[PDB]
Write a protein that binds this ligand. Structure first.
Ligand SMILES: CCCCCC/C=C/C=C/C/C=C/C/C=C/CCCC(=O)O[C@H](COC(=O)CCCCCCCCCCCCCCCCC)COP(=O)(O)O[C@@H]1[C@H](O)[C@H](OP(=O)(O)O)[C@@H](O)[C@H](OP(=O)(O)O)[C@H]1O
Ligand SMILES: CCCCCC/C=C/C=C/C/C=C/C/C=C/CCCC(=O)O[C@H](COC(=O)CCCCCCCCCCCCCCCCC)COP(=O)(O)O[C@@H]1[C@H](O)[C@H](OP(=O)(O)O)[C@@H](O)[C@H](OP(=O)(O)O)[C@H]1O
Ligand SMILES: CC(C)CCC[C@@H](C)[C@H]1CC[C@H]2[C@@H]3CC=C4C[C@@H](O)CC[C@]4(C)[C@H]3CC[C@]12C
Ligand SMILES: CC(C)CCC[C@@H](C)[C@H]1CC[C@H]2[C@@H]3CC=C4C[C@@H](O)CC[C@]4(C)[C@H]3CC[C@]12C
Ligand SMILES: CC(C)CCC[C@@H](C)[C@H]1CC[C@H]2[C@@H]3CC=C4C[C@@H](O)CC[C@]4(C)[C@H]3CC[C@]12C
Ligand SMILES: CC(C)CCC[C@@H](C)[C@H]1CC[C@H]2[C@@H]3CC=C4C[C@@H](O)CC[C@]4(C)[C@H]3CC[C@]12C
Ligand SMILES: [Cl-]
Ligand SMILES: [Cl-]
Ligand SMILES: [Cl-]
Ligand SMILES: [Cl-]
Lengths: 707, 34, 707, 92
């Protein structure tokens, strides 16, 4: 065919049926030539292994990038507190790892590491030392935020954000050229570390999915099958997202579940195993580099009890109530950024947000501590070896009020900051902030329950379930349940989230509580709205996304959504014969229609086919270059084989999808969702009356929702 | 307990080098490119 | 509408689009009636929770039945070895549960337990005692097999077999009335225990899926939403299959993965969380009853090494090489059963197979032991505390040849016996036999590797990976890898299998080796055929099952598959008006068509819709009963509103799916698979030219495969 | 119930003495090698090493659950067989 036929414009949804037909044709062509020569057999073998090779490459790259990002972020975050003079290249834990001056009270207390007060003021302790450390922490946070936002703006504007919403749109057939490019990959990889170092209320776990998707696209350019076909590319991208989640949480099964449930519109059976393999490879690479087998490993000696479900369910409710609130709050704020002029200054917004975050975080130890580190500390169970402040009260009696007050302040600060930090023009992830919020809430609830059990063991439930004077209540389990509940409420992920949490903490004994809390949070959030944060952001950005949840009224019929309607002029059509190249070019230029239907005769209105406008113009130009005398006067014949008329039947679709006007629009939407139709043709009495397009369907659904 | 010094070596050094190269390219674009 | 309209005959596929429209209409009615009264609101609330209630009931029933079946099977299997006079309800382990006469050499040795020889001969040791034990073992196996097959034949013929193939076909849309009924549930529950106790080369894990599906089908009747609609019932059945796998292997995540991968043709996102919840509930129940948290828990202190992948890959290959063989062997045997007279005597076949199995198994220790117990013994890691025979050689030097020879004999016995055992008229499972075969092979391979390492530590690989004189090699890991490889080769499941194995073992450190082995086994099996054992059985049974793998030739067109063709007379059509009730009834009786296309006029041949034969006859009979004077003379008008003509427009489908003759048959098959269409009306120039049916597509594909 | 609860200490072979299992009924805290093992075949100074090599566990079984499950399964099987006999002989 003509070069460039079958391609797509930027910001245009693909036709899955056409891509599948192209893939089948390519498979037939490559298979036919296998017997021709041995080199053809080798090429066919390479093509057959293209999926395995591409998923392996994507997994390896994702694992390496995740490890690099994790270590770089840890080092940069510890940069704020101070510098290890003996080794400018190490973080606090690494600098004090081998120090023999370490004390039980302070594990990370070593002479080699020097805080900025020691560097400049010269005294580790004192009001001047505290002020100097405060100022340097704020300055470093602002510097990291400025670098991240400037790098995003200058090189890869797409690098900002989690990327899960745009990935969801892309995997549904949408095209955003440059989103998964090399520039975006590099800029996002650097800016993720920079942003996590800045201390902003964001995470790097979610954006690693976008990083993996970028790697998958870049590797797919290597293999002809995936470069040529968009649907196969999107399958590779689904595998890449699975690998990204795997590296993010060390949960290959959780990553596969997330890919299946959240980001993958169409999930073939083979893609399941391919994604699992990619996730396993990426997790192996991360385990090979990053350690120096479970990130949030938890050791709760006492098994969870049935009554303990009631607090967990309560946490679930909170997980919903916050979640929906965030979905109602953040979106609004984001919308304001689009409507008002405070969004006109992304760098300034990032800088002010970072300043506020650092200023309010330094006073409170939990806020100052890295969000992932805070989640880890919350998950850890109290023990005699532990010297954590959270457990101090337990040592005192067995100040609880002071610890709970600090935890509540950190919870409020994180809740307020996550609203204004998500959506800014730097790579930000909601997974870690939601996990920290839920973990703080669960820690508070578990402390309260343990206090109730200890003070009031006379209660029959506590006495029967727990022995008197026994620490049956384990706050770490409550923190895990709260984190899972908050994440489920904000994202509405049910199975993938539970499996991800289980893999992240390596606890199969707490699956039931996690599922109960996640279900409670999901139901509570759905009570205030079923759309999740990612889908809400998709709708906010106005991407062409269609979801199974959306549905039409029973009264709506295919005639209602037809493009021609009444006011609009009749849809442009092409005659099968007696049409000049000039006429087709004029029709292409005049209208922005994605494609034009071609009928045998204008009076007959009998559909012959459907030719995409891009394909029409590409074919016309290529034929003009190839064959002389095509000055626009020569006619174009779409029928099967001096003027030397141009033949555009090849670009034509011989069997375009057709529906009837009296067909209800529910069936039309079902067909569009299942088969991924770009457009369908509404015909009455065997003649073309109108055309329904995916864009018209989304327009009607958006109009119904907006009413 | 055991740790790998060379992993941190490579990761930190290459990340810093890439960041510095990006900043230098940004400066070139802002001033030199005009 | 007329009562009985929309119902489906036995051995017929359901139209998923029509079921979706029915569900939407019912939802509209229920939601509309909510404001009418508070009782209507309560009914709507019950409808909304109907899915959660039905999945909860299915999970509870599945857990209870699985626990009861497991305990009864254990007791009845140990009945063959002997009886516990002090307690006729304890198996060998329970009867020696607390005895103080036990010895380190013999764990299950107590005076309380008494072998049949000591019951009847009075001597525990001696040639006569051994002969008596042999005879009683054979007699008990024969009695159990006879009882199982007699119950299957007398009451529930469907109880035979695993049921996974039929579950697949049903979830695809196929209907088998009585397969998931109460009679089948009870008979299968009893017969699974009977067959497992008989000692035949079969398992109860796979059949638990069918048991859970039966429970779900029975519970669906309680809730009108799932009882009225077939697609909703099939979603509930998918959740039930997930719960069944969960109870079978204690793998709720693995159960959901299996449900998506293998049995469920369509898996809506909601069904994912519903299935996970059902599986968790069933597993919780099983833990509540059956224990008295991992069934096949293994403890390999030494982590798996990279070089060990090479043996594992080898095991993988073996898996596939076995799997393919079984698929080519068993099916052939099964085919012979359908072709020759030995299938006319099911009970005799079961008796003979059970006798052969017992006779050849009693002499060898591994074969005599229960298959699940043998798998557990193979999986366990050898240690000084353990007194297993398999590890005796390790104790002696560190006889190996004797243990290896016995293991190979057991492997051969199981491999040859599984071919004949599968397909007989009793509940049989392939999971446990495949696990045992693969575990024996992996144990042999691991013993060989350990012997190579110990004898030859000078090898650079062994010396570098393993310390000299150290038991780095863990044969239990090799046995697990072999079991996974064999199961992947026979079933061809990739991710669900790996997750199920990991859950059944409880170790996430061996997921990479297991995945590699499963990948190798699946690739090797596909080299000899891409169809799994369950799919092969589906094809052998001739069920109307359409798979995504199956595809038509490029040359094939919708015209080729059109029903009228040339030799066949024109397909029957119903005139919109001026056609008598007698004429419709005569057409219904004359032809066995699933439905007739209704055209406006015979000459026009303009399609007005599609009227199902069942709906047509039901409506005609109901109208005759309701309204007097309908003796068949009155005309029938399908058009929208003395003779009092019958109105059959309601039953008729206003917008039947239509395709063009020139459309490639690949597109038609894709549409059928994605939308679950029962039939599509091929029309040319806006007039009816023929009909393609899922039966026609299946027939064409079957002929293509048979060529 | 005593039958429902027990605790066992498994001792692998140590010097002259071979492996030995000591199974008695005791509470969880009373489940220990010194209490479970009485006397110890090994000498006093090596008794501690013998205990270290010894692995002890405390187990509980719901014998009543097995009771009920077996009883109900047997009752159902008997009823089904009686109905089969009814159909084969009496029904004619
Ligand atoms: C250690 C620390 C960790 C860092 C992380 C490392 C992994 C990252 C991968 C490396 C990529 C590198 C980024 C090259 C830019 C690129 O390569 O940028 C293409 C434009 O020229 C150019 O090189 C411009 C180069 C100007 C100077 C480079 C200075 C160097 C900077 C200093 C550090 C470099 C070290 C990296 C080593 C690793 C445009 O290519 P793109 O960036 O791919 O963007 C579009 C997209 O790919 C669409 O794909 P889609 O449809 O799938 O969305 C296509 O279709 C479009 O094609 P078109 O050109 O025909 O429009 C295409 O432009
Ligand atoms: C402890 C040990 C563990 C054991 C396991 C316990 C759980 C098992 C569930 C209990 C079910 C019980 C089985 C009742 C037969 C049934 O109830 O059988 C229906 C036919 O009359 C009858 O009662 C016949 C009753 C003759 C006397 C009963 C003697 C008693 C025997 C001695 C032991 C009983 C103890 C159980 C306690 C628990 C016909 O019902 P079915 O068995 O369901 O078969 C068809 C299918 O359900 C289709 O469903 P589908 O389209 O979804 O595939 C429908 O559509 C058809 O309906 P139709 O009648 O209009 O044709 C329908 O016949
Ligand atoms: C084209 C792309 C996919 C290639 C990516 C290759 C990456 C994944 C490779 C390049 C260098 C590799 C590392 C090189 C050395 C070591 C040390 C060894 O003790 C463990 C593996 C480990 C840590 C490797 C992990 C994988 C690694 C990071
Ligand atoms: C944006 C990111 C990537 C930049 C990171 C650069 C960091 C590591 C640099 C910038 C300024 C540097 C400091 C500048 C001056 C000194 C004084 C010297 O006697 C010891 C090193 C020390 C204390 C440096 C430590 C490393 C340092 C903190
Ligand atoms: C209509 C169907 C779904 C109802 C099925 C209910 C089943 C699951 C119920 C009935 C009796 C129940 C058991 C009754 C008593 C006990 C003892 C307790 O220490 C643990 C739970 C356990 C073991 C219950 C498990 C669940 C159980 C088996
Ligand atoms: C098909 C299945 C359900 C039937 C199970 C019934 C079994 C358990 C029955 C059948 C025959 C029975 C035995 C028949 C005779 C005796 C002798 C008596 O002094 C002690 C009990 C003893 C030894 C019985 C034990 C239980 C027994 C083995
Ligand atoms: Cl994140
Ligand atoms: Cl995110
Ligand atoms: Cl089985
Ligand atoms: Cl099976």
């Amino acid at each position: 065919p003509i070069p460039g036929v079958g391609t797509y414009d930027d910001f245009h949804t693909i036709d899955w049926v056409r891509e599948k037909c192209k893939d089948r044709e390519r498979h037939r062509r490559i298979n036919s030539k296998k017997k021709e020569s041995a080199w053809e057999m080798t090429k066919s073998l390479y093509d057959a292994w293209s999926g395995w090779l591409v998923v392996t490459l994507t997994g390896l790259a994702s694992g390496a990038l995740a490890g690099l990002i994790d270590i770089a972020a840890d080092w940069m975050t510890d940069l704020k507190e101070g510098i290890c003079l003996s080794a400018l290249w190490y973080n606090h834990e690494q600098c004090c790892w081998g120090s023999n001056e370490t004390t039980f009270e302070e594990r990370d207390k070593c002479p080699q590491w020097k805080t900025w007060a020691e560097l400049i003021i010269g005294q580790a302790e004192g009001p001047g030392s505290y002020i100097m450390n405060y100022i340097m922490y704020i300055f470093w946070a602002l510097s990291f935020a400025f670098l991240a936002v400037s790098l995003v703006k200058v090189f890869a504007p797409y690098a900002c954000g989690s990327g899960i919403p745009e990935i969801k749109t892309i995997l549904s057939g949408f095209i955003i050229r440059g989103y998964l490019g090399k520039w975006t990959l590099m800029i996002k990889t650097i800016t993720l570390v920079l942003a996590v170092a800045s201390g902003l209320s964001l995470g790097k776990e979610g954006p690693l999915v976008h990083v993996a998707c970028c790697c998958g696209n870049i590797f797919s350019y290597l293999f002809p099958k995936y470069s040529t076909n968009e649907a196969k590319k999107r399958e590779v991208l689904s595998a890449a997202s699975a690998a990204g989640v795997s590296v993010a949480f060390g949960a290959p099964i959780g990553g596969v579940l997330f890919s299946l449930e959240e980001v993958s519109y169409y999930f073939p059976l083979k893609t399941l195993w391919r994604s699992f393999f990619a996730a396993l490879v990426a997790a192996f690479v991360l385990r090979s580099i990053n350690p120096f087998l479970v990130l949030f490993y938890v050791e709760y000696h006492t098994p969870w009890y049935l009554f303990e479900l009631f607090p967990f369910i309560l946490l679930g409710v909170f997980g919903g109530l916050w979640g929906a609130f965030f979905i109602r709050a953040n979106i609004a704020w984001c919308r304001r950024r689009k409507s008002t002029k405070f969004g006109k200054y992304p760098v300034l917004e990032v800088i002010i947000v970072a300043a506020i975050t650092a200023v309010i975080a330094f006073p409170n130890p939990y806020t100052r501590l890295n969000t992932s580190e805070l989640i880890k500390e919350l998950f850890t169970d109290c023990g005699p070896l532990e010297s954590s402040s959270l457990c101090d009260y337990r040592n005192d009696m067995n100040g609880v009020y002071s610890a709970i007050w600090q935890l509540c302040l950190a919870l409020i600060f994180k809740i307020i900051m996550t609203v204004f930090t998500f959506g800014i023009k730097v790579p930000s992830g909601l997974f870690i902030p939601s996990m920290a919020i839920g973990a703080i809430a669960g820690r508070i609830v578990g402390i309260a329950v343990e206090q109730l059990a200890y003070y009031h063991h006379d209660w029959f439930i506590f006495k029967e379930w727990c022995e008197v004077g026994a620490d049956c209540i384990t706050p770490g389990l409550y923190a895990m349940v709260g984190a899972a509940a908050c994440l489920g409420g904000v994202t509405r992920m049910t199975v993938s989230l539970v499996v991800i949490v289980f893999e992240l903490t390596g606890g199969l004994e707490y699956i039931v509580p996690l599922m109960a809390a996640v279900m409670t949070s999901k139901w509570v959030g759905d009570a205030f709205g079923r759309e999740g944060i990612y889908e809400a952001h998709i709708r906010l950005n106005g991407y062409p996304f269609l979801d199974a949840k959306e549905e039409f009224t029973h009264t709506t019929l295919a005639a209602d959504v037809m493009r021609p309607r009444r006011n609009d002029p009749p849809l442009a059509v092409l005659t099968q014969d007696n049409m000049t190249v000039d006429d087709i070019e004029n029709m292409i230029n005049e209208t922005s229609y994605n494609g034009f239907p071609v009928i045998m005769s204008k009076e007959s209105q009998r559909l012959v086919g459907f030719a995409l406008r891009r394909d029409l113009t590409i074919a016309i130009e290529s034929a003009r270059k190839k064959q002389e005398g095509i000055v626009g006067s020569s006619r174009v014949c779409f029928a099967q084989h001096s003027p030397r008329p141009l033949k555009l039947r090849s670009i034509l679709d011989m069997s375009p999808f057709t529906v009837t006007d009296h067909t209800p629009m529910e069936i039309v939407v079902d067909i569009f969702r299942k088969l991924g139709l770009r457009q369908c043709l509404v015909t009455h009495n065997g003649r073309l009356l109108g055309i329904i397009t995916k864009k018209d369907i989304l327009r009607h659904m958006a109009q119904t929702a907006n009413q | 307990e055991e740790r790998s010094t060379t992993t941190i070596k490579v990761i930190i050094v290459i990340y810093l080098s890439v960041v510095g190269a990006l900043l230098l390219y940004m400066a070139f674009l802002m001033l030199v490119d005009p």
